[PDB]
């Protein structure tokens, strides 16, 4: 997130070389994230966020919020 985040594929360029080295995982399930899901995230996620030691994005999809 504020520490670091990937808005879309253009930002992916930094992680694109060592993305495997970089950690991407469910913010809460903490299960392996299929890079297929990350690829859509990288293709153009409304917001993919990076927290030190913790990564978030898809897990937000695991839960929903209502206004």
Query: In this complex, which beta carbon is closest to Zn ion, that of residue 16 or of residue 29?
Result: 29
- Taking Cα atoms as reference points, which of 54, 31, 56 lies closest to residue 46? 56
Among 6, 24, 26, 33, interactor with Zn ion by CB under 5 A: 26
Does position 59 interact with Zn ion (CB under 5 A)? The reply is: yes
Does position 23 interact with Zn ion (CB under 5 A)? The reply is: no
User: What are the DSSP E strand ranges found in the chain?
Assistant: 4-6, 48-51, 54-56
Does position 62 interact with Zn ion (CB under 5 A)? The reply is: yes
Residues forming a β-bridge with 48: 6
Binding site for Zn ion (CB under 5 A): 26, 29, 59, 62
């Amino acid at each position: 997130a504020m520490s670091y985040s990937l808005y879309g594929t253009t930002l992916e360029q930094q992680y694109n070389k060592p993305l495997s080295d970089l950690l991407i995982r469910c913010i809460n399930c903490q299960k392996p994230l299929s890079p297929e899901e990350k690829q859509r995230h990288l293709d153009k996620k409304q917001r993919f966020h990076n927290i030190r030691g913790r990564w978030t994005g898809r897990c937000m999809s695991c839960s929903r919020s209502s206004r």
